[model samples]
Target: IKQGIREVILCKDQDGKIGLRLKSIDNGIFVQLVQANSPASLVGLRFGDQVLQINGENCAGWSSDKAHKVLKQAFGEKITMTIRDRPFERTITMHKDSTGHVGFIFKNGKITSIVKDSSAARNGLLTEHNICEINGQNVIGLKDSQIADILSTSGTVVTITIMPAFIFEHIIKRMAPSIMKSLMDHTIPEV
Candidate 1:
């Protein structure tokens, strides 16, 4: 219900590492990478989450180096983070046949079905994934027909931007939104 902030807790691995990487851009620190197969990934930490607080200490304006130092010094078995969700969208490139159908069915712009043995299924597209853009054109307010046209004419190669329906609505409610619990399946690759 809260707009964008979520708390993430990660317990250290046997090596005392959490497998998270932070980067500072324009004076704001953000989660840049959560290594797959690590505790950070297991706990749901993800890319593009702006760090707001760490262990209850305000982290706004903290440089990545400073944040890393703090995290490295943290001796606790678990570390807590307050992060603001950002850029919940993921752009995926698909190669289709001459028909240009990537093998997904949609209604109201939400993918209601994914055709097996097709590009969509092979490339990780899933049901309930809402299409936000087609070939860099925003389809947020467009009709289904218009979207279909975009796809049909998009040529053999297409790049579509999408978000899970739940996550899309959460972010759109704000400036258009996860904790480090993943609402979607891990089958989808992070782009």
Candidate 2:
């Protein structure tokens, strides 16, 4: 889907909480988490949506710490946000062969190889697409070996979802760095 801007107006709950967290990645602020059933979530805020503006002030490229401070100072419990969805996210389905291979190799959460003339190749899977989901289950925060197991054992037919690795890793860093760091491959994945 084309990345479109959304303007959302949120009112704090009784606890004076908006229930969403912001993260800075590549100097841009993004929605890192939105509590379910909260005002932010109900208003359509989603994970990885970049914040373009906050309360009529330009917030693009603002650090999360600064953005959070601005949000805390939101006037009279009403906050306005201009945001856009993550770009280039895609989902594809592929059928595994008898050897249980999807014809792609992934390191950590990224697709590192795509075998020519294979299911992944025919389905347009690319090395730049980071693995986001397997069989509709979110794979973020999972170790590479765990992700591989899920991909191989999901079934003969599998549905995979992806986004560009650069953006995906940034989201991962903000939302689940400890889980990512727990793995042995602590180095950043080459984009």
Candidate 3:
């Protein structure tokens, strides 16, 4: 019944790396940072995410040391973690050149197109990138006009956190085939 509750199963990285750092905050234990493509990230773990339970055990009020011990004692590479907070997300910084254009357009809350041979395309951007953050602001639920007000600024560099609709689907789908179907085909569950 906790808020923001979600379950995650993480594995070690390709190189057998553990992809998590924990901090004992008064807010309880939280994931400090997560390594990309590491077992943690591949499973959708994020930085600043707070853990509520582990392997069917309630971890509320547990110290960082206790959490680590339990995590290390888990079964092999597969560890099931329950979090009440969302994962950490990073933004991609797009440096606009003299023209102040990144060669991409946004519509319907996601990237509609990426101009070929343009800054965005050359920078490895794809049409599937979701413009979730812009200039240090969350634009996920904003209107196009409001988003433009922030994008059409005099600044030469614009920083944004883009969700690679392609990367997440590919990795998550391959790592856990069963979950992939529900992930793409269905919405989140209701109480």
lDDT of each: 0.70, 0.73, 0.60
Q: Compared with the true structure, what per-residue lDDT tens digits does model 2 show for residues 12-91?
A: 88777777778887767876666654667656665556888988898867887898898887874678888877543677
Candidate 3: list runs displaced more than 4 Å. 1-3, 13-16, 87-191
TM-score of each: 0.49, 0.65, 0.44
**Deviation from native of the Cα of residue 130 in model 3, angstroms:** 22
Candidate 1 segments whose C-alpha is farther than 4 A from its true place: 1-3, 87-191
Highest TM-score, which number?
2
- What's the distance in Å from true for residue 10, model 1? 1.1
Per-residue alpha-carbon lDDT of candidate 3 for residues 1-191, written as tens digits (9 for 90 to 100): 12468898776556556666566656467764454345665566554467887777878788777887877777656767788653334455667767667778888557878887776777777666656556544454456776777777628777766666553232233233333222221111222
Compute the lDDT of residue 44 as modeled in candidate 2: 64
TM-score quality measure for candidate 2: 0.65
Q: Measured by TM-score, how close is model 3 to the native structure?
A: 0.44
